[PDB]
Amino acid sequence: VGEKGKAGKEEIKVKTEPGMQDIDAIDVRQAIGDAVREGLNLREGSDADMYVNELLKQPVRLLMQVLQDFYTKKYHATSLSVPNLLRNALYGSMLSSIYRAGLNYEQHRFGMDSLCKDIFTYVKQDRDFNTGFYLRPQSESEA
Amino acid sequence: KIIINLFAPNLPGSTKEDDLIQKSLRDQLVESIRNSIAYGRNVFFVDGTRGAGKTTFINSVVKSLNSDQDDVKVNIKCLPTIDPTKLPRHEPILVTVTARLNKMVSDKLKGYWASNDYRKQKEQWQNHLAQLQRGLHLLTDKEYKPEYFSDALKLDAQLDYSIGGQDLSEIFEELVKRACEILDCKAILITFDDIDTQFDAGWDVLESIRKFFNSRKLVVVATGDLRLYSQLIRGKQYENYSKTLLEQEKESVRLAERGYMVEHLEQQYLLKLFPVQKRIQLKTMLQLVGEKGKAGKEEIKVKTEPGMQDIDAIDVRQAIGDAVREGLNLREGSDADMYVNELLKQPVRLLMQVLQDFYTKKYHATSLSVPNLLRNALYGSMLSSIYRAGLNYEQHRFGMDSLCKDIFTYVKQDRDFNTGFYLRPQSESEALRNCSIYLASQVSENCQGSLSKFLQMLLVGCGSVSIFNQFVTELAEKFEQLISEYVAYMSVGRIESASHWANRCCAVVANSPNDEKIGVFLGMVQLNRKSRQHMPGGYKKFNIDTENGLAKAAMASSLSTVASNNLMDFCSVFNLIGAIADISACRCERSAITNAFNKVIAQTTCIVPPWSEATEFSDAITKVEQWLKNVNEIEIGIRPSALLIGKVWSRFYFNLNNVADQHKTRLYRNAEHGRMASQSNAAKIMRFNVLAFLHAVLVEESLYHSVSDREYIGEGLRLNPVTSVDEFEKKIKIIGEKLKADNKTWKNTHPLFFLLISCPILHPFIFPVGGINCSVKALNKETSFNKLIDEIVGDKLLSDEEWDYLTKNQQIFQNTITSLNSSTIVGASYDKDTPA
Amino acid sequence: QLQRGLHLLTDKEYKPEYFSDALKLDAQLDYSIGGQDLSEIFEELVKRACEILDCKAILITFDDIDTQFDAGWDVLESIRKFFNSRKLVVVATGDLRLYSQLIRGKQYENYSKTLLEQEKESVRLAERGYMVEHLEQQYLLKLFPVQKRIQLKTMLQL
Numbered sequence A: 001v002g003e004k005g006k007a008g009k010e011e012i013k014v015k016t017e018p019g020m021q022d023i024d025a026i027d028v029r030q031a032i033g034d035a036v037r038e039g040l041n042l043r044e045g046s047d048a049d050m051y052v053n054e055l056l057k058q059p060v061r062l063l064m065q066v067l068q069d070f071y072t073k074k075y076h077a078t079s080l081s082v083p084n085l086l087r088n089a090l091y092g093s094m095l096s097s098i099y100r101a102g103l104n105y106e107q108h109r110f111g112m113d114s115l116c117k118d119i120f121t122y123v124k125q126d127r128d129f130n131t132g133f134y135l136r137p138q139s140e141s142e143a
Numbered sequence B: 001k002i003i004i005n006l007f008a009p010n011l012p013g014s015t016k017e018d019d020l021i022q023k024s025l026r027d028q029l030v031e032s033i034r035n036s037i038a039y040g041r042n043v044f045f046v047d048g049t050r051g052a053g054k055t056t057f058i059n060s061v062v063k064s065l066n067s068d069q070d071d072v073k074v075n076i077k078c079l080p081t082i083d084p085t086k087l088p089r090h091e092p093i094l095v096t097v098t099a100r101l102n103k104m105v106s107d108k109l110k111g112y113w114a115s116n117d118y119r120k121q122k123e124q125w126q127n128h129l130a131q132l133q134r135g136l137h138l139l140t141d142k143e144y145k146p147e148y149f150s151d152a153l154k155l156d157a158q159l160d161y162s163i164g165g166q167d168l169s170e171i172f173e174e175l176v177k178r179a180c181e182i183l184d185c186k187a188i189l190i191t192f193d194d195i196d197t198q199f200d201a202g203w204d205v206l207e208s209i210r211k212f213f214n215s216r217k218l219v220v221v222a223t224g225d226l227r228l229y230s231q232l233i234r235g236k237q238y239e240n241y242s243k244t245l246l247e248q249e250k251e252s253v254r255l256a257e258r259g260y261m262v263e264h265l266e267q268q269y270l271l272k273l274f275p276v277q278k279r280i281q282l283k284t285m286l287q288l289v290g291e292k293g294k295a296g297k298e299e300i301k302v303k304t305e306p307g308m309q310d311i312d313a314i315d316v317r318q319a320i321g322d323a324v325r326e327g328l329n330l331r332e333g334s335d336a337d338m339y340v341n342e343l344l345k346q347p348v349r350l351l352m353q354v355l356q357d358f359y360t361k362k363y364h365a366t367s368l369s370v371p372n373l374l375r376n377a378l379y380g381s382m383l384s385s386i387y388r389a390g391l392n393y394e395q396h397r398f399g400m401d402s403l404c405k406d407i408f409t410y411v412k413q414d415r416d417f418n419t420g421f422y423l424r425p426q427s428e429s430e431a432l433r434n435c436s437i438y439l440a441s442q443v444s445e446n447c448q449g450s451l452s453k454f455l456q457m458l459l460v461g462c463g464s465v466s467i468f469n470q471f472v473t474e475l476a477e478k479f480e481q482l483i484s485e486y487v488a489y490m491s492v493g494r495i496e497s498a499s500h501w502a503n504r505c506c507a508v509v510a511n512s513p514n515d516e517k518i519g520v521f522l523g524m525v526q527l528n529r530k531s532r533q534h535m536p537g538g539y540k541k542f543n544i545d546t547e548n549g550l551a552k553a554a555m556a557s558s559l560s561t562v563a564s565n566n567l568m569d570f571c572s573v574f575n576l577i578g579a580i581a582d583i584s585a586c587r588c589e590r591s592a593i594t595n596a597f598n599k600v601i602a603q604t605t606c607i608v609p610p611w612s613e614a615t616e617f618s619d620a621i622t623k624v625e626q627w628l629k630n631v632n633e634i635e636i637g638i639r640p641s642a643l644l645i646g647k648v649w650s651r652f653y654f655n656l657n658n659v660a661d662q663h664k665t666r667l668y669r670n671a672e673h674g675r676m677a678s679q680s681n682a683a684k685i686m687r688f689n690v691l692a693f694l695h696a697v698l699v700e701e702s703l704y705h706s707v708s709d710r711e712y713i714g715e716g717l718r719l720n721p722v723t724s725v726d727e728f729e730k731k732i733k734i735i736g737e738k739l740k741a742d743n744k745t746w747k748n749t750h751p752l753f754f755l756l757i758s759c760p761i762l763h764p765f766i767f768p769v770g771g772i773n774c775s776v777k778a779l780n781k782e783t784s785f786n787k788l789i790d791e792i793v794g795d796k797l798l799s800d801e802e803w804d805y806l807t808k809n810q811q812i813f814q815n816t817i818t819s820l821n822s823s824t825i826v827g828a829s830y831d832k833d834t835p836a
Numbered sequence C: 001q002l003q004r005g006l007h008l009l010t011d012k013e014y015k016p017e018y019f020s021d022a023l024k025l026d027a028q029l030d031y032s033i034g035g036q037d038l039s040e041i042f043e044e045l046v047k048r049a050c051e052i053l054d055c056k057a058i059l060i061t062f063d064d065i066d067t068q069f070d071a072g073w074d075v076l077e078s079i080r081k082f083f084n085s086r087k088l089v090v091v092a093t094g095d096l097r098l099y100s101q102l103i104r105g106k107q108y109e110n111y112s113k114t115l116l117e118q119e120k121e122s123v124r125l126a127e128r129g130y131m132v133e134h135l136e137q138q139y140l141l142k143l144f145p146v147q148k149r150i151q152l153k154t155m156l157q158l
């Protein structure tokens, strides 16, 4: 699908609601971009571009599981907390990488001090000190 | 409406509707299952840690789907829940599913009313069972036999079998399809119980689901822990590797990618089996009850005593709090609910067995010692954590000595020597966080209805933690060896008396290498034991016989002697605290008070530790006996806590650091009078040291003692005065006019502080002769300060002439130390003078 | 009847077919405990032998295990499991610090080999040593009461 400015090999579209017409199906990058931008609270910039690109680099199974879980939960909730709903979707797929790092994998332990421990564990695992706290996917390890 | 009955059995089998903690999940999981059938593998997962209630929850789902069989348009038949841990070791899961499915089909065959309908479908079911019978060896074979090839080519099975290879996946798929026709259902629900007891057995469950349960006629729900499944799956992907490659490619460049590859295999294996959109997390009790005031997800109530109805139930958050508010002797605030929050995050099995062992022994006792009831509950509930943390397990030794040993070892592992003696449930570990509330119930139990034992935790429990931190740790494996000497020297867990520990503690504060040779240590002053030439002012060798009856007795307890290279008499404040603890243990008899007064000064031979390289007397016992009778009449209603004991020591210990160095240099030639705040002679160092402890018991106990419901110190800055008395005076002044506003006494609100301000030993230290500052404003605050003490105590400490003699620079005093200021402190050569 | 139950001593596995012979009460001796109890069969065997021999008790004597101290584990296990009756007196000889070394090795065999390798930290290893030392000091106390222990004296003492 390219890199948001390239005429890619294929044009993939996603139906994010039940009964959506194939004609009115938004682009795959936009569907992922909607979750990242409205979930991680980002604007139109290189910060969101690298997140969505990294989600494209994920396996198709992992990509669809994030896509399916996020939008299926979103539709039921609307009948908001998009970051929370995305946190539900991001949790399941990015769960095996949590254990490889040492994150907080208990929802009851979703304490603000744990995130400080999590990020400190993250930046320690990232091995970058002056830029690790940016929470950028600049690492060379998929975890 | 979730009403948990604590006196009910509260077991997965005995759990019914209206007391299911997980009800929104059960309602929404059933709908998700039904919708997936109305429209490959259809597998749902219910996640949760051990004891989260997976077995209780998943049984309700089977019950929910079983009820109203024909009424629901979508028909689902549920097999009985399969528990992999209780199955035979080598019995395949496919055998278990078929055996349970066969009985469900067989009972339906016996239910028909038409002979031909029953006869025709019975042989079809038997035909599929025979095919499965023929092919089960494909699972349990250690090798292939050429005789099987001729059986594989047998295409006379009479069924479709779109692929012919004797595929057990296809044989079971047709068997399930036939079973749905007989049972008249759209799908069959295979249910798997959690594997937390033995997760080794969960590999066959995982393998069977992907190999055999791929039919659209099958829906699977499994419970367990994903992190427990992950280590199970990842431990199998390591078995796919060739072992020879493992030792040969041991380099970190290939071992990293090998660990990376297994993570990729584990990540997709978990995603292949359990889709994320099908997963469900069992919410913890904290996640269901909410926070302090914010409304939670559901509202849940509990029944604490038998025989009440549902309207008498109370919320689980309150019931756990009341067991901690009373069990740990904590008032409502940010330090009591953190224990409730920590218990809410605990597994439900662990939480029920806390609220059961507590209230079962509370209703059977009230038909008390609530701290003792909770401690018994938390002893068994946290028992595995206690063994892991290396504490004392014997219930027949739950005494004062064991508790002080636990505190030292708890902070030895908590890595928190600064504030780790609050026993706060704040540690990153799980065992130490569990023992943080078991030990916090130990303190609230042993130090309940007592004063001698409360100071024992304050001085020996919290004290030995702090003295190690600042005076012994600098010498440190060595650290474990050093503790093997520090605990042995200080006799932690085997003390005789608080003064005996103090006679060793005062050495330790001096054993540590301190510069400038000044004898103003932390919480003590090293009074010179001899004299020489060039002694300016009225300064001489310290004398004990100079003081009168009570003054001699009070300072005799305060004195300590170390048997170093040269014997060094030490006067401290821990000895006063040690003596009070020893005296408060003595009963009303006057034949034993003199023993607690004389065991402290004589026969004291404290050798340096291995890590160190180098009749007016009767007029005081009548006051002690009166105070001792005043102790036993109020000390019963004393309700302290591990937080309060630690917090009091925290304020107390910081003052000793302030006094030690702020008065270290302020010693000059004209310091004997102590008229001005600049002069800080040895009679002022210890005057503030005692006032430091009286203030630590003043502010901290006004904040956390559970007997008081509303604050008394009030909004302001708490600076624990050193070199001054004004802010100490004002806080007593505020409470005096505060207790009068609501017409409340000075005894019930501050039972702990009242019995220490009225202690006969501390009285000659409040107003010494080299003490009180004599400026116009200093006497202005101290005139009311002495009056305030007399008012709260109930009797005058100094008469009109006694105060006037101290303010204006002879009449002997028995309730006031005199010769202390004349004494000179070791290493303080007064070659200078006090600046104006 | 003792021969019928000897297989339990030497069997390397349980035979489900023997459960039918572990349920028969056809014996007129009327053993109070459930069927196939070697500890009980030997008790009436010894009780019967006391009547024939016309004696109050039978003295079972064991030599020392100096030349092979692994052979003494069966002696220790047979004494507690079987030789516990008012009709039986047992006298054993041998180095007590050799029996202790033999019992200590057996108490370590009750630990799973995976746990021993996976928990080598000092805090757990020291606790294991305390448990093993406590376990084998009580084993000697039950097997050999202190008031019945006798220590041979050497020439220097005599």
Ligand SMILES: Nc1ncnc2c1ncn2[C@@H]1O[C@H](COP(=O)(O)OP(=O)(O)OP(=O)(O)O)[C@@H](O)[C@H]1O
Binding pocket: B004, B010, B011, B012, B015, B019, B020, B021, B022, B049, B050, B051, B052, B053, B054, B055, B056, B057, B193, B194, B196, B197, B348, B349, B350, B352
């Ligand atoms: N809905 C409930 N109502 C009351 N008590 C409950 C409930 N759910 C769980 N409990 C309590 O918590 C305990 C947890 O046991 P449960 O079997 O439900 O959990 P599990 O650890 O996932 O299962 P298993 O015993 O199979 O390992 C129960 O024994 C019971 O005491």
